[PDB]
Design a protein around this ligand. Structure first.
Ligand SMILES: [Zn+2]
Ligand SMILES: [Zn+2]
Lengths: 169, 169
């Protein structure tokens, strides 16, 4: 291979209101507003169809990005997929940070589920003001040791068995 | 604030076939398979409803994650939102890496759009085997200088004007 992925540059979703979204992510998660692009038409088309594209700081140079499309029909969803599948999780340093976040969100009126033990990490869950599913998580102190038990042979075997049976291997 | 977001921990989407997805991301983008969770029922429910949750290495500890839900109705989409809105972009080091990636993808039969100049970064676009919109990008050498021209006052003003008019400020 002549190239390697460095990191996630940005992950983009639709939002209902750019200013309300910027304000919420700053207030609830201290995520700073980096920049915005905006145009009154979609590239290569003439028709009036404005958008605002916003970048938010998600840490270590990662960006959480939104588009507001004020002349498009209201955002919907993939009705064939459960809500818990599509989500974004952000890492916090440790349990003290996760509990701090949980308390802060609750004090600001956000319903928070958790803490949930996923073995290699521990998480809390809440919705953003656009209905996106968010997760905050910290890695278990023994996470790398538990992951390292998965050998390349086990990975191959698990995928093959799953491909054959579509039951948990 | 008593906590800070460190980075994106994982971003999750649905995939149609776990093994084909793992194989494609390794072949096309050299993204390694880290681990998988699988169960035959969704937590807290009894009914047969298996899933496989896979983590792929997206660089610097970021994870691109997928779920395969083999007993659910086929994946769909939000029909009220254009395809170009929801997407994920991964960073490459520089133009040589982006052109290497473009050539590699094309040699493996992937249609690639680009290179597109976005001023602060340069990008190529292609679909994954699940219909997700992918982007590879490298940052312009003067990107930080161009972004630094946006003062906190300009950000406030742009959001206020946009909130009022819903036209590009
Ligand atoms: Zn998760
Ligand atoms: Zn993009």
């Amino acid at each position: 291979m002549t190239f390697a992925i460095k990191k996630i540059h940005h992950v983009a979703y639709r939002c209902k209101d750019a200013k309300e979204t910027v304000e919420w992510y700053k207030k609830m998660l201290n995520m700073d507003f980096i920049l915005a692009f905006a145009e009154d038409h979609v590239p290569s088309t003439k028709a009036f169809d404005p958008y605002m594209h916003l970048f938010l700081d998600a840490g270590q140079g990662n960006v959480l990005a939104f588009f507001e499309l004020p002349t498009q029909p209201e955002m919907g969803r993939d009705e064939n997929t459960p809500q818990w599948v599509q989500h974004i999780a952000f890492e916090v340093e440790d349990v003290n940070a996760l509990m701090a976040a949980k308390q802060h969100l609750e004090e600001n009126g956000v319903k928070v589920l958790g803490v949930t033990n996923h073995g290699i990490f521990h998480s809390i869950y809440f919705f953003d003001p656009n209905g996106h599913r968010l997760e905050l998580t910290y890695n278990d102190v023994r996470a790398e040791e538990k992951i390292a038990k998965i050998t390349e042979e086990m990975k191959a075997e698990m995928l093959e068995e799953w491909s054959k049976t579509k039951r948990a291997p």
